[PDB]
Amino acid sequence: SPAKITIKANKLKDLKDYVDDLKTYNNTYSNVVLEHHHH
Amino acid sequence: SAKEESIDVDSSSYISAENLAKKYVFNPKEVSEAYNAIVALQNDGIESDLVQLVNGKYQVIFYPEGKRL
């Protein structure tokens, strides 16, 4: 099903950190695709 | 049918960023735009529809592209 994900924190710093981690891992998993071509 | 998931980073139990990324493929442009909006609000007070104070917490909303393989 379609999904809507709401991420919440009282402090902007904590929200920033979660999103920063998400960004890192989302990019890493997407890079695995390219690695399969490289290797 | 549709799924709404709330991730309360201030709570005693929430899905890790690692596990969220394992579960879903996100459009990187969506995530980057939200991250930059958070930074702009924090650093320069720039308000955006992307990062709002709602019911006592700042929030962003993501619409995953897919379920990760």
B64, B26 contact by CB (below 8 A)? yes
| Residue among A6, A9, A16 whose CB faces B10 most closely | A9
Nearest to A3 by CA among B22, B6, B4, B66: B4
CA-nearest of A29, A35, A16, A36 to B20 is: A29
Instruction: For chain A, give every domain's residue range.
Output: 1-39
Residue B53 corresponds to which tokens in the numbers above? 């104070």
- Tell whether A27 lies on the interface with B, counting CB pairs under 8 A: yes
With beta carbons under 8 A apart, name residues in chain A contacting B12: none
The DSSP letter of residue A11 is S
Which of B5, B25, B58 has its CB closest to that of A5? B5
Q: Which domain holds residue B30?
A: 21-64
CB B56 within 8 A of CB A10: yes
Partner residues linked to A4 by β-bridges: B4
- Helix extents (H) in chain B: 17-23, 28-44
Domain count, chain B: 1
Residue B51 covered by a domain: yes
B15 assigned to some structural domain: no
C-alpha angle with apex B5: B2 to B7, nearest 5 degrees?
170
Final resolution, Å: 1.5
In a domain, B47, yes or no: yes
A10 three-state secondary structure: coil
- DSSP assigned state of B50: T
The answer to whether B50 and B34 are in contact (CB under 8 A) is: yes
Q: Is there a domain that residue B49 lies in?
A: yes
Kindly report the nearest CA distance between residue A30 and chain B, in angstroms: 8
Residue B32 domain flag: yes
